Amino acid sequence: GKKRRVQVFTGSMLQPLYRYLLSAKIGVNPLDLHGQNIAKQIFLKCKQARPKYLQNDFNATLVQDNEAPASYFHAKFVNGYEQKWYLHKSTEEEINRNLKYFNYQIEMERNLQGHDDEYEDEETQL
Amino acid sequence: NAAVREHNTPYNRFIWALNQSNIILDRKILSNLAINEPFSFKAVLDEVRIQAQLQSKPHPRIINPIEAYAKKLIIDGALKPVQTQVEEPLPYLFGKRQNVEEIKKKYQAQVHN
Amino acid sequence: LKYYNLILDEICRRPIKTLQEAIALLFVFSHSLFPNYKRKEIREKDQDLKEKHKIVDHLADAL
Amino acid sequence: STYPKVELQMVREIKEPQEEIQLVDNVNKNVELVNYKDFVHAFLKDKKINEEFNSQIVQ
Amino acid sequence: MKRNILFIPFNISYSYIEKNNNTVKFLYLYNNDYFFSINFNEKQSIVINEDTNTIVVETRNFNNKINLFNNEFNKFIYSWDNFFFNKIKFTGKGFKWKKKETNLFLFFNRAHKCFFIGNNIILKRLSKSKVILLKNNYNHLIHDSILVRTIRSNNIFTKRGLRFSRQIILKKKGKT
Amino acid sequence: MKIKSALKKYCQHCYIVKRGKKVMIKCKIDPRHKQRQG
Amino acid sequence: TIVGSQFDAQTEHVNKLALDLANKKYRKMALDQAVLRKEKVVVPAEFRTEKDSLISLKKELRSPVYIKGHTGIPDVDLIADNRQVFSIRRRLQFQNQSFYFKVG
Amino acid sequence: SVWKNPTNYLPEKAKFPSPKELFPKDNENSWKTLNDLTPSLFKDVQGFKEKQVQRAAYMQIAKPNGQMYHIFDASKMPLGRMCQKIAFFLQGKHRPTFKNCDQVTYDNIIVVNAANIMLTGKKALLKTVKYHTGFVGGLKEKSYKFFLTEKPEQLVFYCISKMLPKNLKRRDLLKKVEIYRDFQHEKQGLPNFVPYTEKETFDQYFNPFVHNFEDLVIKFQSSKETPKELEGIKKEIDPEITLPFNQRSKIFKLNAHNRRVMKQWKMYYRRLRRYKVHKIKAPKNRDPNLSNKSFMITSDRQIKDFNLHNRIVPEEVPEDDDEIMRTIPR
RNA sequence: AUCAUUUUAAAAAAGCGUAAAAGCUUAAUAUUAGAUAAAUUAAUGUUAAAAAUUAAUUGAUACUUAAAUAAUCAUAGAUGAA
Ligand SMILES: [Mg+2]
Ligand SMILES: [Zn+2]
């Protein structure tokens, strides 16, 4: 047909979720039924996803811990932050806004240090 | 059509009964009555309502004006100068923790019950 | 289906104290089952059986 | 004695709808359901085929 | 149904209250400094998680304004003991600025003066081609950040001029 | 912009927006696709 | 296909059911194209009147009906619902099948 | 031995640095001007409907003379309906001793609160008043927006003159009409409408401090830290809030019934956009000295007119090169 | 020409794209969570079964055939709303 000539760039507004992570540790009870599968999917998005938008030292794992109270998603960020989120009651959507509540701040911490943690504009167009 | 609305019927339903009714009277006299002989007008108006089994009623956006005073809708004397416009009462509750005990007393005490 | 349960829910309330009664329920409940084709396509597993043993557990003593 | 007289402004009464919600018991909470279709019967059932439409479509 | 989600930060701690009559339901947020309450109709049902500090809402009333109710509620709480942030850049030859105590001096090929003066903001320079703004309200920020943008913006032919650090940029060929 | 009584969508990205009695089309790719109804 | 090839080789013998079944339908149809099924169909309906005009019916979503008769027989014209009519098409057998109309 | 939900498992939750910890020696008002909060959403969202208040609109008074008085408050009925009955009472059409050939009229009119006027709909903004002034061109249109703010009193006096019969008796009638902007009239021996200044406090719905603590109950609480500002209330914690809507007993379930209701609620909110009050927004000042926002001193004349030599930094002062910090405290 | 295989599914492709290549998206599809599937009519009296039931409607959702109703816009002239 016709050739586009206006190039709309959307690389700088790209904000993936697992990008400021250094590690991860899935925890599973075989007695959960809602807290197992939620952690199944996260472990894929940590490895099935793309490595550009992750750190270089990102290592995700999975362990079956019968001793735990509930299946968990432990995580560790760059600048020191560390948390755990049990999964017998939650959703995959309630988790992501927590990750934004960290990832939105680490920018406010690292930009002040001078670090450009942003992407080129030419990475993804519309 | 204006002397009869003091008695809370309109013209149309008045004469509608007048022809139903036994009475022969003209629109001429009923004018002269309501001006010059008003008591007999209300007399004539009553049986006409009754022989037709009609039932008057006032318009429902009327008040017995004494009731209007009692509800503070209205005052006979002069008015006062209006106060400064109070800030709009918010739909949400907000403040600082350091003043809660001071704020509790105002809301508790005044409207405790 | 909704009203067979009302019947059997009632029979689970009225105990039987003779023997001709229990015979008079098996011979009737036999022919008068609720077929599976009238039931829905999606349903609790083997729910036709659970309709039975409410009776058969209610009869097993007397017979 | 009718002309001390007072009348009022106008009150708008808009009505929320009258049909109300139907809440329902949770019965299939901890239950797993399965289908009981027989694809054998479903295949054999000879249903209408729009042959007249299937002819024009050919060209 | 869309089941909207209410985030709560970690610094905040909350409670939930009802009558014996059960005809009233309301909720109470409380911090070291502030405190804030808001109710829920009889037609709004609610779910809570301490695991995430998130609250879930259904609405039998089917009011579409709630999607705005969220963003106000969410940002009004994160507006307590946290900033919002933004970053500005430029790329060009005869361009510069100078910074003196939240008073930014702009020289982008214009005959007139171009002072920027910040009432109740924070502005801290990280390099010649970069500056961050910080403020607790997001809506004043953009009005504060965009005035800088309107002096020069990105040419659609070359990415020369100012821009935000996260934005949709346009480009068009020229002089092949 | 160009005033088309009969509006029309050229690319899939075109979409409609209504500001009061006002109607128009806009595109995120080709800003020449946009229109108005008058 | 839906199972890996390595498992299908173990179960290659199973597919006789596939082909042994298609014997049954396609032969059954091929010989049952000729015969009318023995199943009675009925259509409740109402008489015609000069009152019920077309557009009156057509907001009520009824439909007129017309019958042409044969030697010595009178014609008959009736009223019925639309969804009856399309359901009468929706059989295989519509080109010839005998349909009844119960007025009373 | 099977899945039982735990009771006391929650870990610590990481505390972030505060702006004081991170940016001392800087303007406190940054982290104290909180985000805007539109009230008008709430009263629509969380279901506050003001009680229907039904104040007085007009009034008829007689005297031992023949003279009658007709009084109106233009903030309570619309403009037209106020203006129809004026022309019906100013003549004597309710007076059965009405001859239209009368050189004398014992009917007097008063109006009050002409500043605030009721106009149903989007009419205060769009409708206009036109006239021509003898000269070519001419044809001056004017908006209600001009009258309703600056001189709203021609308008009430202009619409009356259009309903009255076009004749020579008009001026004698319009000589007997009086209008006021305030809530008073200056006549004495007559009454005055009481204004309605109150505004409903909806405080009983979203505030425990209004209710007595023994009527209330706590169903849920986050921390073991209990506020001292909340003391005396029971704690009957539900096992039911934290359950999502599937794990409950009653589930709201989309269905032909509720979806039928959904569409009724949808029309309700479209059927209410029509019954909405529009307002003349006032003119505006843009004094940079008043606003809490940033601004520009593009030119020099913006300095003198506003005396902004202060906030401008002098030129005889050093600058700031780079303000990076590596370590972020905790 | 429209075959065939591997796949849980994937068109000798319904389209954009290239000097030709590369690259992008739909159809078809999976994991996880949320989530629609509800109401009925007519038949052989009772004996087959580690087992299997026909013809047919209305309705919720998506795809699809499409039409109708209601409002809005669809430029206006020449002494001045006209
Ligand atoms: Mg191929
Ligand atoms: Zn377009």
From TrEMBL, chain C:
Superkingdom per UniProt: Eukaryota
Protein name from the UniProt record: Uncharacterized protein
Species whose genome carries this gene: Tetrahymena thermophila (strain SB210)
Species classification: Eukaryota, Sar, Alveolata, Ciliophora, Intramacronucleata
Stretch of the intact protein here: 320 to 382 of 763
From TrEMBL, chain D:
Record family assignment: Belongs to the mitochondrion-specific ribosomal protein mL43 family.
Subcellular locations according to the entry: Mitochondrion
Organism: Tetrahymena thermophila (strain SB210)
UniProt-recorded name of the protein: Large ribosomal subunit protein mL43
TrEMBL record, chain E:
Listed GO biological process terms: translation
Coiled coil feature spans: none
Gene3D superfamilies the UniProt entry points to: Ribosomal protein L6, alpha-beta domain
SUPFAM superfamilies given in the database record: Ribosomal protein L6
One term of GO molecular function: rRNA binding
Keywords, alphabetical: Mitochondrion
GO cellular component, one term: ribosome
Protein name stated in the entry: Ymf60
UniProt organism field: Tetrahymena thermophila
From TrEMBL, chain G:
Protein name according to UniProt: Uncharacterized protein
Annotated source species: Tetrahymena thermophila (strain SB210)
Keywords for this protein: Coiled coil
Covered range of the whole protein: 26 to 129 of 321
Keyword Coiled coil: yes
Domain of life: Eukaryota
A GO biological-process term: translation
